[PDB]
Design an enzyme around this catalytic site. Structure first.
Site, short mmCIF file in Angstrom:
data_model
loop_
_atom_site.label_atom_id
_atom_site.label_comp_id
_atom_site.label_asym_id
_atom_site.label_seq_id
_atom_site.Cartn_x
_atom_site.Cartn_y
_atom_site.Cartn_z
N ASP A 45 8.48 -15.69 -21.08
CA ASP A 45 7.61 -14.46 -20.15
C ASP A 45 8.54 -13.69 -19.26
O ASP A 45 9.29 -14.44 -18.46
CB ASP A 45 6.51 -14.97 -19.62
N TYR A 50 11.53 -8.07 -13.54
CA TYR A 50 12.28 -9.14 -13.12
C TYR A 50 13.72 -9.07 -12.78
O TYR A 50 14.52 -9.81 -12.34
CB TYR A 50 11.93 -10.37 -13.69
N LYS A 79 7.02 -6.41 -19.96
CA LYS A 79 5.90 -5.79 -19.17
C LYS A 79 6.57 -4.44 -18.79
O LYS A 79 7.62 -4.24 -18.25
CB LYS A 79 5.59 -6.56 -17.96
N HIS A 112 1.98 -4.22 -16.61
CA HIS A 112 2.16 -5.27 -15.79
C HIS A 112 0.96 -5.36 -14.54
O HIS A 112 0.60 -6.48 -14.02
CB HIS A 112 3.50 -5.26 -15.04
N1 LIG Z 1 1.88 -10.17 -12.45
C1 LIG Z 1 2.27 -10.96 -13.19
O1 LIG Z 1 2.13 -10.81 -14.43
C2 LIG Z 1 2.65 -12.28 -12.67
C3 LIG Z 1 2.93 -12.61 -11.41
C4 LIG Z 1 3.43 -13.83 -11.15
C5 LIG Z 1 3.90 -14.58 -11.99
N2 LIG Z 1 4.20 -14.30 -13.21
C6 LIG Z 1 4.94 -14.73 -14.22
O2 LIG Z 1 4.58 -16.27 -14.48
C7 LIG Z 1 5.20 -16.90 -13.95
C8 LIG Z 1 4.64 -17.98 -13.27
O3 LIG Z 1 5.23 -18.85 -12.22
P1 LIG Z 1 5.53 -18.57 -10.67
O4 LIG Z 1 6.95 -17.99 -10.75
O5 LIG Z 1 4.32 -18.03 -10.17
O6 LIG Z 1 5.28 -20.05 -10.39
P2 LIG Z 1 4.67 -21.45 -10.86
O7 LIG Z 1 5.03 -21.51 -12.47
O8 LIG Z 1 3.26 -21.45 -10.80
O9 LIG Z 1 5.45 -22.31 -10.05
C9 LIG Z 1 6.96 -22.36 -9.87
C10 LIG Z 1 7.28 -23.09 -8.70
O10 LIG Z 1 6.97 -24.64 -9.33
C11 LIG Z 1 8.17 -25.21 -9.09
N3 LIG Z 1 7.96 -26.16 -10.40
C12 LIG Z 1 7.95 -25.85 -11.45
N4 LIG Z 1 7.79 -26.94 -12.40
C13 LIG Z 1 7.68 -27.86 -11.46
C14 LIG Z 1 7.26 -29.42 -11.85
N5 LIG Z 1 7.30 -30.02 -13.07
N6 LIG Z 1 7.25 -30.09 -10.70
C15 LIG Z 1 7.30 -29.63 -9.46
N7 LIG Z 1 7.41 -28.11 -8.93
C16 LIG Z 1 7.82 -27.61 -10.28
C17 LIG Z 1 9.27 -24.10 -9.33
O11 LIG Z 1 10.59 -24.91 -8.76
P3 LIG Z 1 11.94 -25.11 -9.60
O12 LIG Z 1 12.12 -23.78 -10.33
O13 LIG Z 1 12.83 -25.57 -8.67
O14 LIG Z 1 11.40 -26.12 -10.65
C18 LIG Z 1 8.85 -23.11 -8.51
O15 LIG Z 1 8.97 -23.17 -7.09
C19 LIG Z 1 6.34 -16.17 -13.46
O16 LIG Z 1 7.68 -16.97 -13.33
C20 LIG Z 1 6.46 -15.08 -14.22
O17 LIG Z 1 6.89 -15.07 -15.36
C21 LIG Z 1 3.61 -13.08 -13.91
C1 LIG Z 2 5.22 -5.20 -5.73
C2 LIG Z 2 4.65 -5.81 -6.76
C3 LIG Z 2 3.37 -5.52 -7.06
C4 LIG Z 2 2.69 -6.03 -8.13
C5 LIG Z 2 3.29 -7.10 -8.74
CL1 LIG Z 2 2.45 -7.91 -10.16
C6 LIG Z 2 4.43 -7.71 -8.52
N1 LIG Z 2 5.05 -8.75 -9.13
C7 LIG Z 2 5.54 -9.86 -8.53
C8 LIG Z 2 5.24 -10.25 -7.35
C9 LIG Z 2 5.73 -11.27 -6.70
C10 LIG Z 2 6.16 -12.33 -7.51
C11 LIG Z 2 6.28 -12.22 -8.91
C12 LIG Z 2 5.78 -11.05 -9.35
C13 LIG Z 2 5.73 -11.18 -10.86
O1 LIG Z 2 4.94 -9.96 -11.26
O2 LIG Z 2 5.94 -11.90 -11.58
C14 LIG Z 2 5.17 -6.79 -7.21
CL2 LIG Z 2 6.89 -7.42 -7.16
#
Ligand SMILES: NC(=O)c1ccc[n+]([C@@H]2O[C@H](COP(=O)([O-])OP(=O)(O)OC[C@H]3O[C@@H](n4cnc5c(N)ncnc54)[C@H](OP(=O)(O)O)[C@@H]3O)[C@@H](O)[C@H]2O)c1
Ligand SMILES: Cc1ccc(Cl)c(Nc2ccccc2C(=O)O)c1Cl
Length: 318
Positions: A45, A50, A79, A112
């Protein structure tokens, strides 16, 4: 290990998150994604936002080069960011991601976030008072342009992210709809289990993909440090001891067993390897029910930065 999408393609049910706080240098996304692939992740993803697609594509292409995987074994999501919602800009944005990735297609392209901002290289444009320069775009018009990306073979599947129910019905009920969204990628974890939105998505054969499934990066200023720490949760930690797993693993397994595709980010070789063990065990009905009780309607990623405009997704109940 895969869920069949409403357009006939297959999405692996565990996905690797590549987003990291800005302080993390770009080179770490390349090495983390390579470890993830070595460890068994096939669903990856990312997004234009990013600023890692050159690194994530190199990692993907490296494991093809070295015979680890074939392109068709990898499910890569990108995205479209808010500065390219305007119909004429959607394909250029997809083609820019592809030239960055040096890939011929993405498996999945998402809108996104449903609030538009002014076109331009700035992903978060702001005026002098620091307020966001929002844009005015018909999201149905955006979707029509995303659909043509599927017609042109640049995106195998297409979907949405951070859409509420009314925004999904707007796509779903649009006249002349060619392709339903295959998925809606949203925050989902035991503290915000999205039961209502999940039940709606199911009703429309839309996969719910959980982000921040582990409680999120907790990166300020996006998340309040006083929010409870999901992975310190007493129930998750007790189920961790009982199963000889970890709380992250419990959090991940919960989603799989309720039919949610689940992302998990980590730049740590040990935890990247740990997280693919989500397939090695299973929770009982009574443990599933206990995890259900953990819901506290606790959103880590409110994205207040984009509130105000009508398209702001998180004001409705769901
Ligand atoms: N709007 C959107 O579409 C959107 C928004 C937010 C996120 N996302 C996407 O979905 C992903 C979701 O992840 P997120 O970045 O929000 O964080 P997450 O997956 O909920 O958690 C990440 C955090 O957890 C830690 N972690 C990971 N595996 C672990 C384990 N086994 N034990 C303990 N800690 C652990 C990581 O540290 P370490 O790296 O040190 O392991 C990091 O600090 C993102 O990376 C991004 O691709 C999408
Ligand atoms: C300003 C703004 C508005 C909406 C989203 Cl979805 C994002 N996206 C993220 C924000 C904080 C951490 C991660 C993201 C992400 O989309 O993964 C941002 Cl940076």
């Amino acid at each position: 290990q895969c869920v069949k999408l409403n357009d006939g393609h297959f999405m692996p049910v565990l996905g690797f998150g590549t987003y990291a706080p800005a302080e993390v240098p770009k080179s770490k996304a390349l090495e983390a994604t390579k470890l993830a692939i070595e460890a068994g992740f096939r669903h990856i993803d990312s997004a234009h936002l990013y600023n890692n697609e050159e690194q994530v594509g190199l990692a993907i292409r490296s494991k093809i080069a070295d015979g680890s995987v074939k392109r068709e074994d990898i499910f890569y999501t990108s995205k479209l960011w808010c500065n390219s919602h305007r119909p004429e800009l959607v394909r250029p944005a997809l083609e820019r991601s592809l030239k960055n990735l040096q890939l011929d297609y993405v498996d999945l392209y998402l809108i996104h976030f449903p609030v538009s901002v002014k076109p331009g290289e700035e992903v978060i444009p702001k005026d002098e008072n620091g307020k966001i320069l929002f844009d005015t775009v018909d999201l149905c018009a955006t979707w029509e342009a995303v659909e043509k990306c599927k017609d042109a073979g640049l995106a195998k599947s297409i979907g949405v992210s951070n859409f509420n129910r009314r925004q999904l019905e707007m796509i779903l009920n649009k006249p002349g709809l060619k392709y339903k969204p295959v998925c809606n990628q949203v925050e989902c974890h035991p503290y915000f289990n999205q039961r209502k939105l999940l039940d709606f998505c199911k009703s429309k054969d839309i996969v719910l993909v959980a982000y921040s499934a582990l409680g999120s990066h907790r990166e300020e200023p996006w998340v309040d440090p006083n929010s409870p720490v999901l992975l310190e949760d007493p129930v998750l930690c007790a189920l961790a001891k009982k199963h000889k797993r970890t709380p992250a693993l419990i959090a991940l397994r919960y989603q799989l067993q309720r039919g949610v595709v689940v992302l998990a980010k980590s730049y740590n070789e040990q935890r990247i390897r740990q997280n693919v063990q989500v397939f090695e065990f299973q929770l009982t009905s009574e443990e599933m029910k206990a995890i259900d009780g953990l819901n506290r309607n606790v959103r880590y990623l409110t994205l207040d930065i984009f509130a105000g405009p009508p398209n702001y997704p998180f004001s409705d109940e769901y």
